[PDB]
Amino acid sequence: PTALAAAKARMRELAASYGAGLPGRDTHSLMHGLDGITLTFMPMGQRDGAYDPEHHVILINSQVRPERQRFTLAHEISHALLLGDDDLLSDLHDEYEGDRLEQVIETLCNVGAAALLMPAELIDDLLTRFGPTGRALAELARRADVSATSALYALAERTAPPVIYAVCALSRAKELTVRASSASAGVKYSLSAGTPVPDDHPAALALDTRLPLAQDSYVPFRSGRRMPAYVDAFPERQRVLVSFALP
Ligand SMILES: [Cl-]
Ligand SMILES: [Zn+2]
Ligand SMILES: [Zn+2]
């Protein structure tokens, strides 16, 4: 493991610790875990949040939607722990400099955000009950209380057997488009955003019929090739969360 992989590993260990000692990862319990810090909600123009370690206070744009609010929180807690760990903080300072480290730390805040909001356990608990499916994703996203995109990467990172996740939305069965996408450990096939969803494809039917599905099908590679694999489409508020277990 290289520095960026060692740092991320560390940051996960950290989120893991802080979080571990929480009665859940709900926004309110994330707050209680704050070892005496002023958490203030207020309008921050076009800025989701900030963390002020001199005045020991996290600020979270109140304007924004609960989704990003909860995340911007998880994100700024993570930032606080990084500054807490003098090693991860130090090792970092001797490997990156200037904006280069700045980018690295806002990256490690996101790695940690996810570790906080989406416990390894939960992913596996769901990956066990529901397997690697478009519903394992629908459940983790609704259950950790984060976005399909936020839960798209977390779930694909615990999935062993080659699989390809993707969260979908309409163009306007009806015709939909790939928005986010995630490859399991094994997979090297890539399903990028903008890729469209044929009307005959299970997933379309799924979101159209506002009804879950699951059947052998194919990965509708934007390019043109229809690669077969077991799809599980889970529709909901106009998003079709879907899995593509490449055989
Ligand atoms: Cl930030
Ligand atoms: Zn920050
Ligand atoms: Zn940040």
Please calculate the CA angle 195-122-184 and round it to the nearest 5 degrees.
35
C-alpha distance across the termini of the chain, in Å: 28
Ligand that comes closest to the CA of residue 77:
2
Structure tokens at 236: 């909901």
Per-residue DSSP letters for 103-166? HHHHHHHHHHHHHHHS-HHHHHHHHHHS-SSHHHHHHHHHHHT--HHHHHHHHHTT--S--EEE
CB-based burial of residue 97 (10 Å sphere; 0-12 exposed, 13-18 middle, 19+ buried)? Answer: exposed
Ligand nearest to the CA of 109: 3
Largest CA-CA distance found in the chain, in angstroms, rounded: 57
Q: Is 76 a catalytic residue?
A: yes
Dist. CA 83 → ligand 1 center (Å): 14
Residue 109 CA to ligand 1 center (angstroms) comes to 8
106 has binding-site annotation: yes
The structure was resolved experimentally with X-ray
Domains of the chain listed by start with CATH number: 1-118 (1.10.10.2910), 119-159 (1.10.10.1030), 160-247 (3.30.450.130)
Beta-bridge mates of residue 232 = 243
